[PDB]
Amino acid sequence: SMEQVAMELRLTELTRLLRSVLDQLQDKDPARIFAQPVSLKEVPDYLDHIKHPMDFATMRKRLEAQGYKNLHEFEEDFDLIIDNCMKYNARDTVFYRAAVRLRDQGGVVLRQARREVDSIG
Numbered sequence: 156s157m158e159q160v161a162m163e164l165r166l167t168e169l170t171r172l173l174r175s176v177l178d179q180l181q182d183k184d185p186a187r188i189f190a191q192p193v194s195l196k197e198v199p200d201y202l203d204h205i206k207h208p209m210d211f212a213t214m215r216k217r218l219e220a221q222g223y224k225n226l227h228e229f230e231e232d233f234d235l236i237i238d239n240c241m242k243y244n245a246r247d248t249v250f251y252r253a254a255v256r257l258r259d260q261g262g263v264v265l266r267q268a269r270r271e272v273d274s275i276g
């Protein structure tokens with residue numbers, strides 16, 4: 156049907172926008188602290204702490220799977236990366252401080268991105 160393809164063309168180019176956003180979010184993580192899931196081999200008790208782990212690699216797989224149906228779902232995943240980190244790691248750790256910076260520096264990018272989405276519908 157002509158309805159699903161035009162729709163697809165939106166879901167597909169929502170995807171296109173969010174990939175752009177994601178690459179900008181990740182550049183705010185130069186040390187690549189959030190690039191990959193926390194190693195369960197290196198932190199075996201991790202899941203006893205964090206019930207919904209998240210990282211940039213995992214977001215990217217969902218992104219390419221066209222798994223984000225809107226910007227809200229995407230931001231939820233971004234938030235998980237930051238909030239997990241600020242619970243698991245103490246305040247005076249390179250980890251915690253890295254999540255604070257990412258959250259602060261990320262906010263303007265998400266600010267823009269929210270304005271583009273409602274714009275192009």
Ligand SMILES: CC(=O)N1CCN(S(C)(=O)=O)CC1
Pocket residue numbers: 188189193194197198239240243244250
């Ligand atoms: C995301 C997070 O909280 N990290 C702290 C633990 N480190 S680790 C296993 O020591 O390299 C990975 C990043």
